[PDB]
Design a binder for this molecule. Sequence first.
Ligand SMILES: OC[C@H]1O[C@@H](O[C@H]2[C@H](O)[C@@H](O)[C@H](O[C@H]3[C@H](O)[C@@H](O)[C@@H](O)O[C@@H]3CO)O[C@@H]2CO)[C@H](O)[C@@H](O)[C@@H]1O
Length: 348
Amino acid sequence: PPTQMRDLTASQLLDEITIGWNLGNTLDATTTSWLPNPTPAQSETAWGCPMTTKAMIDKVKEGGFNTVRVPVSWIDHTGSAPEYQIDEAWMNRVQEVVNYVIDNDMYCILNIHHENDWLIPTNAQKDSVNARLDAIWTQIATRFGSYDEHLIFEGMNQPRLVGDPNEWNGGNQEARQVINSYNQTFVNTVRATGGNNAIRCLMVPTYAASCSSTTVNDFVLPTDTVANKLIVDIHSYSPYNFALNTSGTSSFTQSDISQLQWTLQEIYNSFGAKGIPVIIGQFGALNKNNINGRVLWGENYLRIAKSYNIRCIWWDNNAFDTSGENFGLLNRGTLTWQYPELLEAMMK
Ligand SMILES: OC[C@H]1O[C@@H](O[C@H]2[C@H](O)[C@@H](O)[C@H](O[C@H]3[C@H](O)[C@@H](O)[C@@H](O)O[C@@H]3CO)O[C@@H]2CO)[C@H](O)[C@@H](O)[C@@H]1O
């Protein structure tokens, strides 16, 4: 039966969120290019993370987060068209992990993540993609339909033109248009299940979850069956060279605060100031053995974001000193905060 649910607007729900944490490189890990039919365990552990436990989520809450984003890649667990049946064992594991969060009295965001092999924003793919989106979102929404307002569905992650010269610079006009259709389908698909899903808050991204003039001007918030339940998700690993470029500078100084203020103000001006709720569903700064700079960056990022009433969700991929992107914060195997000064900076 349905869990009793508070009917709150998106703004009201966002005002209950403090700061969030992503379970990164976990249920979002893909194996598509070498293992077509992974078991749930093969997927969850494919990218350097152990099997998730309740104790890990307990530690996230203890550290000061009250929200967990659970990115999930469904592609390697989805059957053939037209049913696109999701593997039952996978759906069961996703629910187990969601429950680690929900049963901790936390907010939880559940999405579809690395789907770009099929989630292609072109007119030629549009009808096929809308059909698959509806097929998979009906399955996810019905499994999770009984949950209360603490569970938020996010319809897509970073829809984009993979391999395009402007993949990460707004794509093209056609792609931005088609993404509006995909977000509209997602909203319609969830509302069609009724119950608590009729009044659940839902999150939708812009093109590549990017905030720029190009992606904002062409973005259309879906039409909804209920008022004030939609939130835009922007990922903002800013400033790029410091935070996300593995070859970029490791320095962040007083002089960089002004560019960060401008970047975050642009998110506010594009959405929150216009009465469109917005959340930074992923941010972070790579470990470059630069703790003083990351502490200064982190204190100011959260201070400025809060000053614009924008909640933030750290991207934690459990990676510290690898040759890849090291966005770890919680060392999941030791249950230790590896960068305590940075955690403290973001929690003040
Ligand atoms: O090392 C394990 C595995 O890592 C894969 O790269 C990951 C990054 O580690 C991860 O930080 C990144 O996270 C991105 C997130 O999924 C996006 O939503 C977006 O906001 O940007 C984040 C930061 O880049 O995802 C990638 C995967 O796309 C390697 O691809 C893989 O080869 C390797 O085994």
